[PDB]
Amino acid sequence: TLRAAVFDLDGVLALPAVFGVLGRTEEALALPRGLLNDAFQKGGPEGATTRLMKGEITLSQWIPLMEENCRKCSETAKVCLPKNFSIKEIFDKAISARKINRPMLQAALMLRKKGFTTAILTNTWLDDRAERDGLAQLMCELKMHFDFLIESCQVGMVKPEPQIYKFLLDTLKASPSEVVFLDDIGANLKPARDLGMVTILVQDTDTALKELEKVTGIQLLNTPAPLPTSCNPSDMSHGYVTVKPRVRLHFVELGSGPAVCLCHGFPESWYSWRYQIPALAQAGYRVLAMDMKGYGESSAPPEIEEYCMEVLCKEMVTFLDKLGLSQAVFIGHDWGGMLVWYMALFYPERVRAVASLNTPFIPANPNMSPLESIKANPVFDYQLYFQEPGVAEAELEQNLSRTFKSLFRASDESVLSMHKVCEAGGLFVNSPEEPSLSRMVTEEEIQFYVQQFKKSGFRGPLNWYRNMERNWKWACKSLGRKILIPALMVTAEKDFVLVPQMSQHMEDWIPHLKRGHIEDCGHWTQMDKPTEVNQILIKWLDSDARN
Amino acid sequence: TLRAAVFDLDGVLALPAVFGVLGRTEEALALPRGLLNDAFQKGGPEGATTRLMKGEITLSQWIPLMEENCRKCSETAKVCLPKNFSIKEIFDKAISARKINRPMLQAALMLRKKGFTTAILTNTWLDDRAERDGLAQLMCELKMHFDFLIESCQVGMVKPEPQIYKFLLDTLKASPSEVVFLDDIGANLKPARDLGMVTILVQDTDTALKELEKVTGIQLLNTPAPLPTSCNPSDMSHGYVTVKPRVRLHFVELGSGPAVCLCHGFPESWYSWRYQIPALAQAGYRVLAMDMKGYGESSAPPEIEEYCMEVLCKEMVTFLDKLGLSQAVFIGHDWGGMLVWYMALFYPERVRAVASLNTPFIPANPNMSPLESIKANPVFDYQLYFQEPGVAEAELEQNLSRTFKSLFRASDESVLSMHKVCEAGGLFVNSPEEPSLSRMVTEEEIQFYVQQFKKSGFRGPLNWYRNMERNWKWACKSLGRKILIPALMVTAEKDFVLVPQMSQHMEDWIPHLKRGHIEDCGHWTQMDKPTEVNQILIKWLDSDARN
Numbered sequence A, B: 001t002l003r004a005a006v007f008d009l010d011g012v013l014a015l016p017a018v019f020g021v022l023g024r025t026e027e028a029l030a031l032p033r034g035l036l037n038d039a040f041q042k043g044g045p046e047g048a049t050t051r052l053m054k055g056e057i058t059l060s061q062w063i064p065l066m067e068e069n070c071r072k073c074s075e076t077a078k079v080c081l082p083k084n085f086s087i088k089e090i091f092d093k094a095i096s097a098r099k100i101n102r103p104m105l106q107a108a109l110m111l112r113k114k115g116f117t118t119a120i121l122t123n124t125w126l127d128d129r130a131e132r133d134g135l136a137q138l139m140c141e142l143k144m145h146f147d148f149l150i151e152s153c154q155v156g157m158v159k160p161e162p163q164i165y166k167f168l169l170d171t172l173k174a175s176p177s178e179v180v181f182l183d184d185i186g187a188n189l190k191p192a193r194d195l196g197m198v199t200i201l202v203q204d205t206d207t208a209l210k211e212l213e214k215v216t217g218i219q220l221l222n223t224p225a226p227l228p229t230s231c232n233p234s235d236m237s238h239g240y241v242t243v244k245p246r247v248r249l250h251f252v253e254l255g256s257g258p259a260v261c262l263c264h265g266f267p268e269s270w271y272s273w274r275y276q277i278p279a280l281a282q283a284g285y286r287v288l289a290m291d292m293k294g295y296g297e298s299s300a301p302p303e304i305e306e307y308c309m310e311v312l313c314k315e316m317v318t319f320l321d322k323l324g325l326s327q328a329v330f331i332g333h334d335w336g337g338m339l340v341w342y343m344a345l346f347y348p349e350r351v352r353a354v355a356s357l358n359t360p361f362i363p364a365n366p367n368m369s370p371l372e373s374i375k376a377n378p379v380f381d382y383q384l385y386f387q388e389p390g391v392a393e394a395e396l397e398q399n400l401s402r403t404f405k406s407l408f409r410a411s412d413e414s415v416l417s418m419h420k421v422c423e424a425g426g427l428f429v430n431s432p433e434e435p436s437l438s439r440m441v442t443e444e445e446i447q448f449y450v451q452q453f454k455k456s457g458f459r460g461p462l463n464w465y466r467n468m469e470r471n472w473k474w475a476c477k478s479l480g481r482k483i484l485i486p487a488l489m490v491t492a493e494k495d496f497v498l499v500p501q502m503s504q505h506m507e508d509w510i511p512h513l514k515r516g517h518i519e520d521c522g523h524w525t526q527m528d529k530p531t532e533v534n535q536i537l538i539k540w541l542d543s544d545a546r547n
């Protein structure tokens, strides 16, 4: 029966409740109880606060009217007010102190995930204070998790006026009986109740969630930690930059602040960063998630030399030039990680900081040819298999769904054997035709990769492996240098190709290197342990990248 | 004969010359003359400075080696060094002090404009200092004005090695005889000369430009102020955001820093901001030049209600949401200006600051209908002509080139009569078939607008005029508010439709309003006086928008 849940902002989705700062101010200042509450509601429906809440006047216009009420109220109470009493100072502090009530947001997220239509119904104001950005960010973060945000100052109505409730129902396209409404004010629940909808008087979160759990019949409390926010492709801002006549790079962009350029590995896409994009943006950064050359919506020329690291890096510099960015933090994973280490080696001027997941920095060996080196490591046999043009393309392109379902797997799952691929004659020779779905990805997500790769296939992607000698020669030019800019190396315990031990000597070339290590994490680091990645990158960014 | 000009960086395109800080340090510190110069060049071709200049080692790795040389040199000279002598401090200061030599850049720009192939040839280093961003920005600004940038640390060669010169010529695809090379170091000119190319020993800029002027035969000195940098459509980063199922907004983006959203008027496009986009980005802002709904690459639905200000503004908020921006400075012109005033009135939380060119803020009159008001102003007759769907579309779409050539005109040019358009039966009834080309625009630029408008035509654009009553009603909801966020109103003296006097009472609703006024400027403010606009917006942004 229940199909929708409506949450109040102050006191329910955000705490401490701003309205609840009037009482704390009275006690702190030793003023008569409710004095500030009276002045706040002075005049009732005709009062300054109701005009403010309906959108008739702005908050800054209101502040002066509230001070006047505060004097009249004290006047009638025969009490003075502090020497530097200031309504603006009181509300600036109260508003900035208010934060998102996480467990309540989680319950909303869960209900929505199970079919519920969710909305926020709040009496609020048009904030023109010089500190307004604070509230804007709060609303923006919350706003994105609900189907509707109904603000009184926007619709010209205010709880408890029944009109706002009829509006609500109209917006919900639902009848009272199928709506739960939580608020921390009894008076605002009465109208909802009269209309016949379920109502919860929210005092303490746990108790409210218990009632909410009971009435909805869905487990909301004591529930496991959910995964971080992921993004929907069609809700992203999509950018395109032509760095050369036949080369255009695509990227997804989100957030403000220092620029953070994410570089995925093989054979992935910008979407591989779906878990950290919202998180890093929320943390105060401008994220640019790339579709590296050869992938997705980025150009994919056929020539092999078009994918040697020298060229790819140059293009990334041009990419920064075109976007008008003097610098950007470069964070890469797998082949992308190899690319950022070289961006730091050849263009320190352009890299604010560098971070790599799984991929270590190992200076080229002037004496041994790359191919000789590759043959010396059993697990790198598949790389030799990738050399001859067309062979790997055919196998990987035959059944796209199978390819990604076979590759994208957690360590405790049936991970692909990487031993005698050439001898075996293929990469999936010993794999089932219909691989099971990994715990790390949904059927829809796999199909996203499937569609992306239907455009250019694996030729451009595979070409990243066909410039060993060329990249080797270019790398030898930096053997005398050292990475001296902020750097972070993150190792993955269960990555059997890009093993942690492989990075044990990195400090010799990167003295100030900072580290990170993730337990029980496979090769697909971002998908495997998204919560751990975000925590590690954000902590590093705030200390070594933002300054 | 001459077809290319090559410029050195230090001492030629940038001053003061960083290398010239060694002498100033010796005198300041009362050290033996040339002591620092000796240590700087210690070891010659095998010295630390040459390795640094070829890319073998980074600047930070170099600093320690230069200090060692400084001690050995003083040792042999029997002289001590200050107590807190610091090579890093000396170069950090010297490098940040170095700036672009504008008149020299102007000469390069002029020569290039007249067919010359231009390039920068410089001995430089891989900067990994914590202050590296400074140099990166300098290079980026200069870099964009030349065909080639050849840095020694990038190509592994250094002047005076003749190999670098052969490389140069090879890059230029030209023979010595047709190349002019300016440098402030004789030794670096000798090789060029031996190869037979023209060379100029640059001491003082004026003298160098005189020789350069004489040898090229092109006026470079005492020349008029050039127009600010404009952008090439295909070199821009193009962004797309879906704010609704059938509505996707396109914008050009450039720069880092606070977000600045530019909103053009009727019937224009993002390109109308071509002169301020590079400038505002260069000034330290992240510019987002919109193609407003109905134009260019943005969606253009047919329905009239899709263009009422309420909807357009909502979409702009969603646009900010999708991009992950809590705020943005909104700067509009013409209809765009009308849009930002309303963004400030209904979404103060989202507007960091608001600025309008030509369009004043006039609160709706609750008693008079919009149409009544429009008929009361003779110059607004054309608006009545725009009402009936299809009529204006036919005239404006018949000959696109003529439409823009007829509209885009400076005040001293044949500006379109805006008196009895309806009576006249049209907007171009008294206009020539082949309008002359305005001084404000080239034939290519007109054709840019032509192509943009071939996609959707004038229906969506014109619909901006067909929501008078609707916008009026929505506006009446804000009659009790006031604009209290940072605001700037810029008036144009010769704009005969959006007249300056029209904004004379704005302070009644915007007390803290800041102003700007441009003399001898028509309606197309950005195109008309681009240099004045940039100066006014940048000055305001730095004082009221950046904080």
Ligand SMILES: O=C(Nc1ccc(I)cc1)NC1CCCCC1
Pocket: A265, A266, A267, A334, A335, A338, A359, A382, A407, A416, A497
């Ligand atoms: O090879 C990979 N990743 C990879 C290879 C095969 C598969 I199936 C999945 C990932 N990484 C490279 C990064 C650059 C240095 C050599 C190893």
Ligand SMILES: O=C(Nc1ccc(I)cc1)NC1CCCCC1
Pocket: B265, B266, B267, B334, B335, B338, B359, B382, B407, B416, B497
């Ligand atoms: O009408 C214009 N601009 C315009 C009109 C006709 C032509 I031909 C060119 C610009 N501006 C509007 C802005 C919003 C308030 C009314 C006037």
Ligand SMILES: [Mg+2]
Pocket: A008, A009, A010, A011, A012, A017, A183, A184, A185
């Ligand atoms: Mg509440």
Ligand SMILES: [Mg+2]
Pocket: B008, B009, B010, B011, B012, B017, B183, B184, B185
């Ligand atoms: Mg020089």
